């Protein structure tokens, strides 16, 4: 009704929260603390946070252990991503208590296991598209790819539950066909640097646009998180 749920972002690398320009790697400008941060989203009234390992995903590490403090901090709804490619990695993140992980590489490189773990596991379960035109991208340490639209008709038969979408050339364009691929919920993540952009993309939530990520914005004090809750409703 209405309603994008709003999801402020913490990406991890290095132990600490950091800004990732584009779908990119070493561009990093740090914010400081992880935890410093995930608890002032929450005490400015967020209802989520979307919690990253960047080393993880990059194959330059992990903070597993750090990620895993923050978590057990928050109030609120946790979604965790960032190399959950195995088992033992999955079984991890969902430790937690997180309410959902976004699988991404391991959809591209292991369909199948992406495939059992959405049979086990449900909508703890969300797949991550990161989209160049119609082909999509993985942080594999060998260059992945996969076509947009089979993709999204493996994932949707295989009963996946949410998908989190990227532009990697807000394009409202690729959401919206995303959204038309799919019966499934749909959650935008990147390119809000303005309110603006916000209600462009709460304008989607009728197409199947559930909520919008949102990391850079906030950090450099575009808007206050206040500010965004007011406007996504």
Same mark, same amino acid.
């Given at each position: 009704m209405s309603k994008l749920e709003l999801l402020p972002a913490v990406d991890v690398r290095d132990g600490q929260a950091v800004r990732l320009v584009h779908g990119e790697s070493g561009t990093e400008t740090s914010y400081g +603390?992880? $935890?410093?941060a995930a608890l002032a989203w929450q005490? +400015? #009234? @967020?209802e989520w946070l979307h919690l990253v390992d960047l080393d993880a995903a990059f194959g330059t590490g992990d903070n597993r252990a750090l990620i895993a403090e923050v978590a057990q901090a928050m109030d609120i709804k946790v979604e $965790?991503?960032?190399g959950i490619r195995d088992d033992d990695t999955l079984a @991890? @993140? $969902? @430790?937690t208590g997180c309410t959902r992980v976004n699988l991404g590489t391991a959809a591209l490189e292991t369909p199948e296991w992406v495939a059992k773990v959405i049979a086990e596991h449900g909508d703890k379960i969300a797949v991550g598209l990161d989209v160049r035109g119609t =082909? $999509?991208?993985g942080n #594999?340490? =060998?260059?992945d790819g996969g076509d947009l639209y089979e993709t999204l008709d493996r994932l949707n038969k295989e009963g996946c539950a949410r998908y989190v979408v990227t532009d990697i050339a807000p394009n409202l364009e690729l959401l919206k066909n995303v959204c038309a691929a799919t019966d499934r919920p749909v959650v935008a993540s990147g390119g809000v640097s303005s309110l603006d952009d916000l209600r462009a993309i709460a304008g989607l939530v009728p197409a199947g646009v559930e909520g919008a990520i949102v990391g850079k914005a906030l950090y450099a004090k575009a808007? =206050?998180?206040e500010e965004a809750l007011e406007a996504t409703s």
């Open positions: +603390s992880p $935890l410093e005490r +400015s #009234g @967020a $965790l991503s960032g @991890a @993140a $969902l @430790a =082909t $999509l991208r #594999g340490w =060998t260059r808007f =206050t998180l």
